[PDB]
Amino acid sequence: CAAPCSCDGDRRVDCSGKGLTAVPEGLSAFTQALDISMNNITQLPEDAFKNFPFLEELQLAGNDLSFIHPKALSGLKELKVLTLQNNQLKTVPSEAIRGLSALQSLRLDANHITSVPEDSFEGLVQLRHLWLDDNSLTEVPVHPLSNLPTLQALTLALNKISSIPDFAFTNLSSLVVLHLHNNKIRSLSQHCFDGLDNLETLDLNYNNLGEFPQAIKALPSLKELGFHSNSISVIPDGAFDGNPLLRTIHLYDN
Amino acid sequence: CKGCLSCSKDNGCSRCQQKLFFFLRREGMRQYGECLHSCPSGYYGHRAPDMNRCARCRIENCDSCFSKDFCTKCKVGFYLHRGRCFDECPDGFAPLEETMECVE
Numbered sequence: 113c114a115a116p117c118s119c120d121g122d123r124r125v126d127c128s129g130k131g132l133t134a135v136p137e138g139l140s141a142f143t144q145a146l147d148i149s150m151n152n153i154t155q156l157p158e159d160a161f162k163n164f165p166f167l168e169e170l171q172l173a174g175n176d177l178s179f180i181h182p183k184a185l186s187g188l189k190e191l192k193v194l195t196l197q198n199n200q201l202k203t204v205p206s207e208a209i210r211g212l213s214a215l216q217s218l219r220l221d222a223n224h225i226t227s228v229p230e231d232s233f234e235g236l237v238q239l240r241h242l243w244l245d246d247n248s249l250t251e252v253p254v255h256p257l258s259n260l261p262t263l264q265a266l267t268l269a270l271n272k273i274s275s276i277p278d279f280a281f282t283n284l285s286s287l288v289v290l291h292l293h294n295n296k297i298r299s300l301s302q303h304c305f306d307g308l309d310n311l312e313t314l315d316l317n318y319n320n321l322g323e324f325p326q327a328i329k330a331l332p333s334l335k336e337l338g339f340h341s342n343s344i345s346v347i348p349d350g351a352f353d354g355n356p357l358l359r360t361i362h363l364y365d366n
Numbered sequence: 367c368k369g370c371l372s373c374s375k376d377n378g379c380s381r382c383q384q385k386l387f388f389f390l391r392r393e394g395m396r397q398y399g400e401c402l403h404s405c406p407s408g409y410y411g412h413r414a415p416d417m418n419r420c421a422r423c424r425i426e427n428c429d430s431c432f433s434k435d436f437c438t439k440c441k442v443g444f445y446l447h448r449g450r451c452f453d454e455c456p457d458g459f460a461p462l463e464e465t466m467e468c469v470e
């Protein structure tokens with residue numbers, strides 16, 4: 113257990129707020145949990161994590177990370193959870209995360225992402241929860257999304273999206289929870305939601321919807337549909353025949 | 367008083383930074399705000415344009431939840447199935463102890 117990192121008997125190491133400007137060394141490779149949150153790691157050099165092949169959960173919350181080397185996280189086959197929230201990333205590090213086959217949960221919220229390369233998320237066959245909150249996205253990344261056949265929960269709140277084209281989520285047959293609140297959506301194509309046959313919770317708070325989204329007629333397992341605080345004015349007759357399992361509806365403040 | 371726009375001694379933090387979670391901690395009678403980069407166990411970070419706040423994981427048998435009802439990992443004795451906690455793996459599914467979650 114090298115200073116200033118505080119470890120425990122479960123190979124879990126915490127180095128939060130130690131002011132480190134680079135990855136600390138002198139740590140056992142057996143460590144699985146590693147946290148460098150609230151630190152000053154401005155950048156990540158090449159293969160900076162070669163010493164930790166037994167890493168399962170890695171946290172980099174609020175470290176002011178800017179640039180990741182393409183081979184920075186090579187050989188992290190045992191990685192399950194990776195968090196990079198609240199940093200200075202502008203584009204998704206597609207090259208960095210190419211080889212993380214066993215990655216399960218990926219956080220990306222609170223960064224300054226504005227676009228995503230098409231080739232991102234390739235080979236991420238174990239992804240289950242993906243965050244994308246608090247970015248400057250202006251359209252849903254359909255093509256990168258299609259490479260996630262095992263997703264379960266995807267959130268895109270507080271982005272700057274405006275509309276969702278048809279079949280934008282056609283490949284996420286395993287999706288369960290989708291979030292889009294506080295976005296700037298105002299139009300939704302008729303088949304935009306087709307394929308989400310396992311969707312359960314669709315959240316659409318704080319949008320500019322002026323017409324009812326008949327696209328929701330393709331959610332056989334919908335249970336919560338909250339689109340309150342919108343510009344909705346009319347609910348047509350029989351606008352819910354595709355959701356025979358609804359539990360609650362948030363349409364107040366409309 | 368870390369990462370706090372306006373910290374008062376009696377009430378702790380009262381306005382977290384722009385990209386930070388405002389969380390209320392109960393201890394004895396003392397209750398005071400805090401700023402964290404990620405909400406603790408039993409809470410799910412709910413984002414907002416004014417202030418981002420943590421809320422209790424309403425789903426039972428949960429220790430860490432991604433949203434108000436989707437649990438990333440349940441407590442012991444309950445396998446994970448589509449983010450929901452079940453003691454047994456239902457039909458079409460079998461228990462898998464190595465990761466403690468329901469597999470096909």
Ligand SMILES: *[C@@H]1O[C@H](CO)[C@@H](O)[C@H](O)[C@H]1NC(C)=O
Nearest residue numbers: 131132133151152153154176
């Ligand atoms: C972080 O590291 C950079 C590069 O060395 C330095 O310029 C900056 O002052 C550091 N910030 C803090 C808060 O230590």
Ligand SMILES: *[C@@H]1O[C@H](CO)[C@@H](O)[C@H](O)[C@H]1NC(C)=O
Nearest residue numbers: 258259281282283284285307
């Ligand atoms: C998955 O995406 C690919 C690439 O667009 C597409 O060919 C395929 O039909 C999709 N699978 C579906 C929609 O089930």
